[PDB]
Amino acid sequence: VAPTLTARLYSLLFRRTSTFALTIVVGALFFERAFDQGADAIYEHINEGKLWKHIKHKYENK
Amino acid sequence: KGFSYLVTATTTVGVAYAAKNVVSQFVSSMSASADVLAMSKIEIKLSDIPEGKNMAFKWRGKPLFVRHRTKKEIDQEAAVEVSQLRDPQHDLERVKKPEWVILIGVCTHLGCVPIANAGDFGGYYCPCHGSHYDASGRIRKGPAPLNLEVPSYEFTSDDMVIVG
Amino acid sequence: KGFSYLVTATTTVGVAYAAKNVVSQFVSSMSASADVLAMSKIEIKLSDIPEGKNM
Amino acid sequence: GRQFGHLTRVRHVITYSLSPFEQRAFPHYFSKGIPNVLRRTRACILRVAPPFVAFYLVYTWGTQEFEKSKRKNPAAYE
Amino acid sequence: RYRQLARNWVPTASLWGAVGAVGLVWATDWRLILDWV
Amino acid sequence: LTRFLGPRYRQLARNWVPTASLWGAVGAVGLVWATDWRLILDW
Amino acid sequence: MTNIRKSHPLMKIVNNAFIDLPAPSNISSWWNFGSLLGICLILQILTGLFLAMHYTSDTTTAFSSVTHICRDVNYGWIIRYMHANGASMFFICLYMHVGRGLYYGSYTFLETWNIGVILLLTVMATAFMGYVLPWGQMSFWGATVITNLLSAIPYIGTNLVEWIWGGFSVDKATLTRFFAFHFILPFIIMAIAMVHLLFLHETGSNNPTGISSDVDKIPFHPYYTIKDILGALLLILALMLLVLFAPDLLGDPDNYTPANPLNTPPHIKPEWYFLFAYAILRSIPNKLGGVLALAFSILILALIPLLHTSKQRSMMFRPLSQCLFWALVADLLTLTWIGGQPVEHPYITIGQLASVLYFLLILVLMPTAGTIENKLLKW
Amino acid sequence: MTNIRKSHPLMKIVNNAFIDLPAPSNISSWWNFGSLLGICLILQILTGLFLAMHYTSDTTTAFSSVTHICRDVNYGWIIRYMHANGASMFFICLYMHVGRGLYYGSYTFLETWNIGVILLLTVMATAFMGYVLPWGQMSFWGATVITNLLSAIPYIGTNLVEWIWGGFSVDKATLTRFFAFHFILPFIIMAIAMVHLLFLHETGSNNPTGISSDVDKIPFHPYYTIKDILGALLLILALMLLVLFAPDLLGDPDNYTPANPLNTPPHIKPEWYFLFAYAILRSIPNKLGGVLALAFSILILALIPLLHTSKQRSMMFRPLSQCLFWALVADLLTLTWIGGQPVEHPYITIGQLASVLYFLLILVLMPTAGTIENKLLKW
Amino acid sequence: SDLELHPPSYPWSHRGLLSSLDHTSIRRGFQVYKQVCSSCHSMDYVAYRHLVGVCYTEDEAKALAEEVEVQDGPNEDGEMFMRPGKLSDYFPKPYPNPEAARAANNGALPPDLSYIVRARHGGEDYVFSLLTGYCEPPTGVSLREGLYFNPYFPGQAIGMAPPIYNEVLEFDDGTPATMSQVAKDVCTFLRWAAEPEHDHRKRMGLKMLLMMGLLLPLVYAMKRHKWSVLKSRKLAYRPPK
Ligand code: HEC
Ligand code: HEM
Ligand code: HEM
Ligand code: HEM
Ligand code: HEM
Ligand code: FES
């Protein structure tokens, strides 16, 4: 036997609220980045070449 | 215990992401609107000031001095013993072309505008508390701690200087 | 007793007169200005427009 | 949470007072006032007297000295 | 003297503070502090 | 509404009118200073 | 209870902190500054709202706007000068308030003294922003020099000063911001004042003697409501005496000149209420040292509760402290004088000694004097 | 007690109305609108203060100013479109609030009801002046025609419309007034809100069943803090959905046109919150009759307590009122529609019967229905 | 009291929640405004800030903004010595001041296009169906020359010269300049110009939509757990005796 993923997570990070909070701070960080990355990608995909990011070429450095 | 806590824990992170982002937006607005682009590092002058008379221009709410110096002024500034200056700089470290000295016209003491051709060094004199600057914008006497600031600038063709 | 009441009453009257003037002054500034009210009621123009149109 | 029936305990104190309409707002005000005002002021002046004297003396010196330096410079160097 | 009494807190206290300080900056994401990781 | 109405109450109303009557006069005086009717001024 | 108007409405009960509350009997005239302080906030507020009924917040107009308020608008002249003069009062009154709790040990009420301190420094920001609204020479340059004083902070400062200004100088950006903050700080302040009063209603007001008066307590309504009204009477007297006979007298600044960003009054200085701080700031050579020292002048206040050494919260029965107390006020007066002084030798050397004497009086002299007195009494 | 943080500070005890308070168990989702109500008040304010950090209150500039907030200023666009949209929400939320009070008889709390009413009307003023700040064609005219609608009063009116405007029209004078009152109302309103809360805290929250819950009471902290946070989450959702995807959708007015005093959008009308008010005025031929009836629209709220006829403060058990409650709401929707309608036959005739329906529903139908239901229950 | 015709929900790249602006359209459109439209209508809040918004480089738009200050320049603004260079300058006012403007167009006053898509009720649809909508006056109708008949004007008559006509201008790339094809590009530049924040907002909205949805789901679950105990609990009355 081993602790369910949650039980593992629990005893390592959620017993102590100091840890818990630390987690959340960390998480908030990591999460913001992934979300953005993913969620920006997703949104740019839906407008391929519609956005200046796609279109800079034409008049850039000759 | 782990599963119930995780939902709340996952939830806490989500509020923080948005909360950090939401808070940033209100804060961002005060910091930048049109801002520096509208009022920062943009200038163009030369015709207005001539014959050794300093010209002042409104650049980012502050006076920008473009002064056409005489050979005598240039020579006097050359003969200063930098080692005895409170903010030691050689005139040539402050200009690109000796006949032209470009300075942020703000006294480094408390912000007043130094008066050109006044003071004991024919440079500038700040009337607020008596700081005397030489024709190089270097502080020679008074409470100012630093020489007047030198901005970034370049000279294009067709007699012009671009500051910023 | 009457004298005491009278003294209290007198103080109120003085305050009210000042209060009326003070209150009136605050109200007066808000209601109108001699900036605006300079242009009010003062208008003339003629003979510069077509015998036909409407300005 | 009650401020009047709960302040403190007081035993054996009698207080005598009179109504506003029976007395005068000021009883012998000129006579009473001059003594108390005069007596209180002397003690007050002494305790606070030191702070006042220093400020007056320094202000006079500062105005004079600042003015004095500004006033003459040509005579000194020739 | 005082430290011995608060020694348990000191260890526990130390962990919370580092986490809290790091987390605020992390949520804050100030560029200069972050550059180091 | 109905409960308030009573045969007994009348003395209070009579008393109220004077105090009320006196109160009413004050407003006219109060309004008048602000109103500044030329006619009021004429009075 | 039935038909006891007061406790009937719960709301109306809350108001019986004015009428029924235990009030000490003995009680210097000094106390009337709390109430007066609040009259000043209300005055400022009504005035402000009528001024801000005809003001504009732009470079171009501001000046004009104020100028228009004082000329074509009906009774806007007094409203504005009442406004300006008011704020002087507001401060004169505030510094009596602080003196009285510096003297009598009112600051013993830690909680209440920390709200006071918050109050005092909130009112300071409002007065700093409101003076620039007009956009006159003095205003213009004063907000540049002060704000830029913030750029003494090493890492951030610089970026931060530019955020506050909303640009590289003080143009429109900055002037609208001040208008907005000036208008909303006094409304936030009003809630703090009521939070202040809240705490202070839990322990009642101290006295001259410094001893509990629970043995001799008076109804606020009968007595204090008249005293307060009377104190208003005098308060307004001073306001109107100022505003009617000598409008400008107390408003040192004569700069009714539209701001020209190259131009400078060599004599740049905050109004009277800020001079102390100013002088203390110039005494330090280094910029950053000055800013910290500037802060500490004012922020030093919260430390006094810890500094208290004596066993008699009342200065009343303590000579030596009464003597240093007064000096510090006269030192304070000395420092205000330096504020309108050319920054030259004579004043420099004076100010410097004054600045050390202020911190001594607060940080070292008094504390010791407290001990001594205790040991003389054999305490 | 010792080291019970809460009651230690007296101040922090006052905050235990959130955490420790008796809150009924059963409780529709409807009650989250109280809290959200506050949410909106706080969001408008933060938003307002930043916009009023870059807005100017002059004829010339105001349009420009807003235009500049939405273009050159960083994140000024969302702040402004968040502020516009918010106010929609603020009202959408308000009208849920009053619905609930109407339906479950929360309005029994007369004193709380009367504050509510004041609340409602105060916000109403706020919204009317803010929309005029940007000084665009819709705003310009809307102020004239509303304000002028006050000149219906026979003796005074006329003089009085001219005082409010600060002149004969709506030039600068009026424009700066609205800026100042818009700014200061919300602060005053917050005081009211808290006063409202104060009274409500003395009898707690009614329920769908309509019976006391004292026998069932729950921790506000444990349960109702998450509910409220969740409520937010949905509230924000709606506010960003609006603000991000359809910024202008809900802001009927397309008049981004600088106001030209000779020009007129033949279709002049208040916003969605004020749409009902405009419609009420239309059904009456006579001006004065329309102003009275407009006031009575809104002001009729405070009657309902006295109108209550049933023995069950809960409409929940009385079908018939649940039917006429809904109809009023749908009559209210019907009226809102008229608001954006040409004032012609089709709409006239409709509005007129809707304005009678509304007052019947409130004045006469419901009250009778109450009785009936009571008599069918044999009560 | 004349029926007003209303604009189609014309197929736009951006009609959709996530859809965004097509800069090439913007670009094109711009020119249309600048050549076709700068003559009588102004755009005051628009600076020469297309850079990233319109994919025109900084050097590109600097240059584009330089010639506009060389010909229309700050001499019409009040800058006497002004010539080429500056980028803070706003699009050049067709005429000194409004009153003029009406004279040039005989009583009418060319609306500032800055906000026109947003400004006119009915959005870019109306704007496109106005320009592209021009039909023959209706049997038995009279028209003063200025009063051209347009099928989509409130009052059923507008003072508008040939807004746009085939081959009015020419675009760099080679986009076929049809009356309509040009209108599709002109509107778009207006929509982008009218609501600069909106273009950014749609992208933000997508991010906001996902976060809000995720947050909402957790809260419902988080909310349920806290309130679970009251819900889970069943209370059974117990007889006193
Ligand atoms: C030759 C000068 C001229 C040009 C070029 C021009 N317009 Fe106009 N436009 C006018 C005038 C004059 C009016 C006023 C119409 C009226 O008041 O009947 C007008 C009216 C309008 C309207 C009507 C809005 C309303 O309901 O009042 C719109 C939309 C408009 N212009 C947009 C445009 C656009 C987009 C372009 C370029 C593609 C353009 N205009 C080109 C002169 C011009
Ligand atoms: C107690 C807090 C306040 C203080 C200390 C204060 C102080 C000041 C001061 C010192 C000035 C400069 C006037 C001059 O010298 O010309 C000023 C101006 C102004 N204040 Fe206030 N004020 C306060 C509250 C308010 C409030 C509540 C409002 C509006 C609701 C307001 C609105 C204004 C306006 C609009 C001006 C500019 C017009 C003028 O110059 O008079 N102020 N204020
Ligand atoms: C906006 C400014 C302020 C207002 C409106 C205000 C209001 C009041 C009022 C009405 C009282 C009761 C009567 C009195 O004792 O005079 C009082 C007492 C008090 N205030 Fe202030 N206050 C203000 C600023 C301050 C400041 C700046 C401080 C100190 C930092 C302070 C600290 C105190 C203390 C300690 C008391 C209680 C003293 C005692 O009665 O024993 N207050 N305040
Ligand atoms: C719930 C109370 C308030 C409501 C209902 C409200 C509503 C409004 C509305 C409907 C507009 C018109 C915006 C437009 O359509 O362009 C507006 C504008 C404005 N409001 Fe607010 N507002 C409120 C509170 C405030 C506060 C507290 C402030 C200042 C602290 C403020 C400052 C402004 C400013 C400066 C504008 C003008 C620029 C613009 O159009 O955005 N408002 N307000
Ligand atoms: C500024 C606008 C307002 C705010 C922020 C606000 C806020 C609140 C909140 C947070 C609650 C508690 C939850 C609930 O029952 O929904 C509440 C309850 C209540 N409000 Fe409001 N409210 C406002 C306007 C009004 C108005 C205009 C009235 C009536 C004229 C009103 C009357 C009431 C009543 C009677 C209750 C108690 C109902 C009950 O639970 O039995 N409110 N309010
Ligand atoms: S600004 Fe202080 S001496 Fe020049």
PDB file of N, CA and C and ligand atoms in Angstrom, chain G residues 184, chain H residues 40-41 44-53 55 62 66 80 83-84 87 90 123 126-134 182-184 186-187, ligand 4:
ATOM      1  N   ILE G 184     -11.772  62.537  -2.404  1.00  0.00           N
ATOM      2  CA  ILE G 184     -12.222  61.286  -1.784  1.00  0.00           C
ATOM      3  C   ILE G 184     -11.512  60.962  -0.494  1.00  0.00           C
TER       4      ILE G 184
ATOM      5  N   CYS H  40     -20.846  46.136  -5.713  1.00  0.00           N
ATOM      6  CA  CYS H  40     -20.972  46.939  -6.894  1.00  0.00           C
ATOM      7  C   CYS H  40     -20.635  48.335  -6.402  1.00  0.00           C
ATOM      8  N   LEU H  41     -21.049  48.602  -5.140  1.00  0.00           N
ATOM      9  CA  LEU H  41     -20.810  49.930  -4.673  1.00  0.00           C
ATOM     10  C   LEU H  41     -19.308  50.181  -4.550  1.00  0.00           C
ATOM     11  N   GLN H  44     -17.713  50.344  -8.260  1.00  0.00           N
ATOM     12  CA  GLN H  44     -17.904  51.635  -8.921  1.00  0.00           C
ATOM     13  C   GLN H  44     -16.895  52.661  -8.368  1.00  0.00           C
ATOM     14  N   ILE H  45     -16.783  52.615  -7.037  1.00  0.00           N
ATOM     15  CA  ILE H  45     -15.969  53.593  -6.357  1.00  0.00           C
ATOM     16  C   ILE H  45     -14.500  53.549  -6.780  1.00  0.00           C
ATOM     17  N   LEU H  46     -13.871  52.376  -6.695  1.00  0.00           N
ATOM     18  CA  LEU H  46     -12.465  52.142  -7.091  1.00  0.00           C
ATOM     19  C   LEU H  46     -12.331  52.576  -8.556  1.00  0.00           C
ATOM     20  N   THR H  47     -13.316  52.196  -9.356  1.00  0.00           N
ATOM     21  CA  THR H  47     -13.294  52.495 -10.770  1.00  0.00           C
ATOM     22  C   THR H  47     -13.398  54.009 -10.948  1.00  0.00           C
ATOM     23  N   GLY H  48     -14.349  54.628 -10.262  1.00  0.00           N
ATOM     24  CA  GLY H  48     -14.658  56.040 -10.370  1.00  0.00           C
ATOM     25  C   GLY H  48     -13.430  56.866 -10.053  1.00  0.00           C
ATOM     26  N   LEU H  49     -12.845  56.516  -8.926  1.00  0.00           N
ATOM     27  CA  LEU H  49     -11.669  57.256  -8.464  1.00  0.00           C
ATOM     28  C   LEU H  49     -10.542  57.154  -9.473  1.00  0.00           C
ATOM     29  N   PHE H  50     -10.366  56.021 -10.161  1.00  0.00           N
ATOM     30  CA  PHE H  50      -9.320  55.995 -11.183  1.00  0.00           C
ATOM     31  C   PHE H  50      -9.768  56.790 -12.386  1.00  0.00           C
ATOM     32  N   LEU H  51     -11.053  56.751 -12.751  1.00  0.00           N
ATOM     33  CA  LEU H  51     -11.436  57.488 -13.976  1.00  0.00           C
ATOM     34  C   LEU H  51     -11.298  58.967 -13.648  1.00  0.00           C
ATOM     35  N   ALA H  52     -11.805  59.341 -12.465  1.00  0.00           N
ATOM     36  CA  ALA H  52     -11.668  60.708 -11.997  1.00  0.00           C
ATOM     37  C   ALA H  52     -10.221  61.051 -11.663  1.00  0.00           C
ATOM     38  N   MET H  53      -9.320  60.088 -11.822  1.00  0.00           N
ATOM     39  CA  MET H  53      -7.898  60.324 -11.878  1.00  0.00           C
ATOM     40  C   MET H  53      -7.476  60.726 -13.299  1.00  0.00           C
ATOM     41  N   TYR H  55     -10.006  62.337 -15.818  1.00  0.00           N
ATOM     42  CA  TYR H  55     -11.194  62.979 -16.388  1.00  0.00           C
ATOM     43  C   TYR H  55     -11.164  64.480 -16.118  1.00  0.00           C
ATOM     44  N   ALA H  62     -14.251  67.379 -21.447  1.00  0.00           N
ATOM     45  CA  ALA H  62     -14.967  66.203 -20.980  1.00  0.00           C
ATOM     46  C   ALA H  62     -15.116  65.102 -22.012  1.00  0.00           C
ATOM     47  N   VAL H  66     -12.801  61.716 -21.686  1.00  0.00           N
ATOM     48  CA  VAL H  66     -13.209  60.310 -21.634  1.00  0.00           C
ATOM     49  C   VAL H  66     -12.496  59.572 -22.769  1.00  0.00           C
ATOM     50  N   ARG H  80     -12.847  52.295 -17.662  1.00  0.00           N
ATOM     51  CA  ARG H  80     -14.039  52.993 -18.048  1.00  0.00           C
ATOM     52  C   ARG H  80     -15.178  52.103 -18.485  1.00  0.00           C
ATOM     53  N   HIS H  83     -16.614  50.504 -15.547  1.00  0.00           N
ATOM     54  CA  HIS H  83     -17.389  51.461 -14.790  1.00  0.00           C
ATOM     55  C   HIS H  83     -18.769  51.669 -15.431  1.00  0.00           C
ATOM     56  N   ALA H  84     -18.801  51.657 -16.770  1.00  0.00           N
ATOM     57  CA  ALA H  84     -20.091  51.932 -17.393  1.00  0.00           C
ATOM     58  C   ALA H  84     -20.930  50.701 -17.104  1.00  0.00           C
ATOM     59  N   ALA H  87     -22.470  49.786 -13.544  1.00  0.00           N
ATOM     60  CA  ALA H  87     -23.618  50.548 -13.121  1.00  0.00           C
ATOM     61  C   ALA H  87     -24.873  49.862 -13.615  1.00  0.00           C
ATOM     62  N   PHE H  90     -25.075  47.113 -11.144  1.00  0.00           N
ATOM     63  CA  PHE H  90     -25.519  47.746  -9.926  1.00  0.00           C
ATOM     64  C   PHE H  90     -27.020  47.889  -9.890  1.00  0.00           C
ATOM     65  N   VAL H 123     -28.905  56.171  -5.280  1.00  0.00           N
ATOM     66  CA  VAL H 123     -28.127  55.619  -6.400  1.00  0.00           C
ATOM     67  C   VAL H 123     -28.709  56.162  -7.689  1.00  0.00           C
ATOM     68  N   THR H 126     -27.113  59.469  -8.337  1.00  0.00           N
ATOM     69  CA  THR H 126     -25.851  59.173  -8.839  1.00  0.00           C
ATOM     70  C   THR H 126     -25.742  58.834 -10.338  1.00  0.00           C
ATOM     71  N   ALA H 127     -26.558  57.849 -10.733  1.00  0.00           N
ATOM     72  CA  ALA H 127     -26.498  57.283 -12.084  1.00  0.00           C
ATOM     73  C   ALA H 127     -26.905  58.319 -13.097  1.00  0.00           C
ATOM     74  N   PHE H 128     -27.765  59.233 -12.642  1.00  0.00           N
ATOM     75  CA  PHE H 128     -28.313  60.224 -13.555  1.00  0.00           C
ATOM     76  C   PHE H 128     -27.250  61.257 -13.837  1.00  0.00           C
ATOM     77  N   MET H 129     -26.472  61.625 -12.837  1.00  0.00           N
ATOM     78  CA  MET H 129     -25.413  62.620 -13.079  1.00  0.00           C
ATOM     79  C   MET H 129     -24.157  62.074 -13.735  1.00  0.00           C
ATOM     80  N   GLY H 130     -23.699  60.882 -13.366  1.00  0.00           N
ATOM     81  CA  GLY H 130     -22.551  60.286 -14.001  1.00  0.00           C
ATOM     82  C   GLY H 130     -22.718  60.166 -15.494  1.00  0.00           C
ATOM     83  N   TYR H 131     -23.921  59.896 -15.958  1.00  0.00           N
ATOM     84  CA  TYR H 131     -24.046  59.529 -17.379  1.00  0.00           C
ATOM     85  C   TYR H 131     -23.853  60.798 -18.196  1.00  0.00           C
ATOM     86  N   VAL H 132     -23.930  61.931 -17.521  1.00  0.00           N
ATOM     87  CA  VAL H 132     -23.863  63.240 -18.134  1.00  0.00           C
ATOM     88  C   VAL H 132     -22.471  63.831 -18.141  1.00  0.00           C
ATOM     89  N   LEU H 133     -21.679  63.207 -17.263  1.00  0.00           N
ATOM     90  CA  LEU H 133     -20.272  63.639 -17.214  1.00  0.00           C
ATOM     91  C   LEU H 133     -19.612  63.567 -18.560  1.00  0.00           C
ATOM     92  N   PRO H 134     -19.706  62.503 -19.300  1.00  0.00           N
ATOM     93  CA  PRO H 134     -19.028  62.410 -20.579  1.00  0.00           C
ATOM     94  C   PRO H 134     -19.526  63.433 -21.584  1.00  0.00           C
ATOM     95  N   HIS H 182     -21.688  63.720  -8.195  1.00  0.00           N
ATOM     96  CA  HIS H 182     -21.543  62.297  -8.554  1.00  0.00           C
ATOM     97  C   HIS H 182     -20.485  61.742  -7.579  1.00  0.00           C
ATOM     98  N   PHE H 183     -19.456  62.539  -7.349  1.00  0.00           N
ATOM     99  CA  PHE H 183     -18.314  62.107  -6.571  1.00  0.00           C
ATOM    100  C   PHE H 183     -18.557  61.859  -5.126  1.00  0.00           C
ATOM    101  N   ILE H 184     -19.487  62.648  -4.609  1.00  0.00           N
ATOM    102  CA  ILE H 184     -19.711  62.702  -3.186  1.00  0.00           C
ATOM    103  C   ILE H 184     -20.909  61.951  -2.663  1.00  0.00           C
ATOM    104  N   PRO H 186     -21.884  58.740  -3.689  1.00  0.00           N
ATOM    105  CA  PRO H 186     -21.482  57.373  -3.359  1.00  0.00           C
ATOM    106  C   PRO H 186     -20.839  57.285  -2.004  1.00  0.00           C
ATOM    107  N   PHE H 187     -20.078  58.326  -1.666  1.00  0.00           N
ATOM    108  CA  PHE H 187     -19.474  58.225  -0.300  1.00  0.00           C
ATOM    109  C   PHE H 187     -20.613  58.356   0.708  1.00  0.00           C
TER     110      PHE H 187
HETATM  111  C1  HEM J   4     -23.074  53.781  -8.415  1.00  0.00           C
HETATM  112  C2  HEM J   4     -22.586  55.065  -8.328  1.00  0.00           C
HETATM  113  C3  HEM J   4     -22.121  55.508  -9.749  1.00  0.00           C
HETATM  114  C4  HEM J   4     -22.773  55.191 -10.837  1.00  0.00           C
HETATM  115  C5  HEM J   4     -24.191  54.620 -11.063  1.00  0.00           C
HETATM  116  C6  HEM J   4     -22.000  55.740 -11.950  1.00  0.00           C
HETATM  117  C7  HEM J   4     -22.413  55.773 -13.273  1.00  0.00           C
HETATM  118  C8  HEM J   4     -21.774  56.477 -14.268  1.00  0.00           C
HETATM  119  C9  HEM J   4     -22.193  56.497 -15.650  1.00  0.00           C
HETATM  120  C10 HEM J   4     -23.462  55.786 -16.112  1.00  0.00           C
HETATM  121  C11 HEM J   4     -21.333  57.236 -16.337  1.00  0.00           C
HETATM  122  C12 HEM J   4     -21.299  57.562 -17.834  1.00  0.00           C
HETATM  123  C13 HEM J   4     -20.189  56.841 -18.618  1.00  0.00           C
HETATM  124  C14 HEM J   4     -20.405  56.710 -20.103  1.00  0.00           C
HETATM  125  O1  HEM J   4     -21.429  56.078 -20.476  1.00  0.00           O
HETATM  126  O2  HEM J   4     -19.473  57.234 -20.778  1.00  0.00           O
HETATM  127  C15 HEM J   4     -20.308  57.686 -15.402  1.00  0.00           C
HETATM  128  C16 HEM J   4     -19.193  58.453 -15.700  1.00  0.00           C
HETATM  129  C17 HEM J   4     -18.208  58.897 -14.850  1.00  0.00           C
HETATM  130  N1  HEM J   4     -18.185  58.553 -13.516  1.00  0.00           N
HETATM  131 FE1  HEM J   4     -19.386  57.239 -12.559  1.00  0.00          FE
HETATM  132  N2  HEM J   4     -20.824  56.273 -11.476  1.00  0.00           N
HETATM  133  C18 HEM J   4     -20.887  56.153 -10.115  1.00  0.00           C
HETATM  134  C19 HEM J   4     -19.897  56.535  -9.217  1.00  0.00           C
HETATM  135  C20 HEM J   4     -18.796  57.299  -9.585  1.00  0.00           C
HETATM  136  C21 HEM J   4     -17.736  57.683  -8.679  1.00  0.00           C
HETATM  137  C22 HEM J   4     -17.715  57.297  -7.213  1.00  0.00           C
HETATM  138  C23 HEM J   4     -16.844  58.421  -9.352  1.00  0.00           C
HETATM  139  C24 HEM J   4     -15.552  59.074  -8.843  1.00  0.00           C
HETATM  140  C25 HEM J   4     -14.889  58.585  -7.785  1.00  0.00           C
HETATM  141  C26 HEM J   4     -17.342  58.507 -10.713  1.00  0.00           C
HETATM  142  C27 HEM J   4     -16.674  59.159 -11.711  1.00  0.00           C
HETATM  143  C28 HEM J   4     -17.060  59.193 -13.028  1.00  0.00           C
HETATM  144  C29 HEM J   4     -16.346  59.907 -14.078  1.00  0.00           C
HETATM  145  C30 HEM J   4     -15.087  60.768 -13.910  1.00  0.00           C
HETATM  146  C31 HEM J   4     -17.084  59.751 -15.189  1.00  0.00           C
HETATM  147  C32 HEM J   4     -16.768  60.367 -16.545  1.00  0.00           C
HETATM  148  C33 HEM J   4     -16.051  59.689 -17.665  1.00  0.00           C
HETATM  149  C34 HEM J   4     -16.747  58.510 -18.292  1.00  0.00           C
HETATM  150  O3  HEM J   4     -17.685  58.655 -19.125  1.00  0.00           O
HETATM  151  O4  HEM J   4     -16.254  57.437 -17.867  1.00  0.00           O
HETATM  152  N3  HEM J   4     -18.526  57.811 -10.835  1.00  0.00           N
HETATM  153  N4  HEM J   4     -20.609  57.226 -14.132  1.00  0.00           N
END
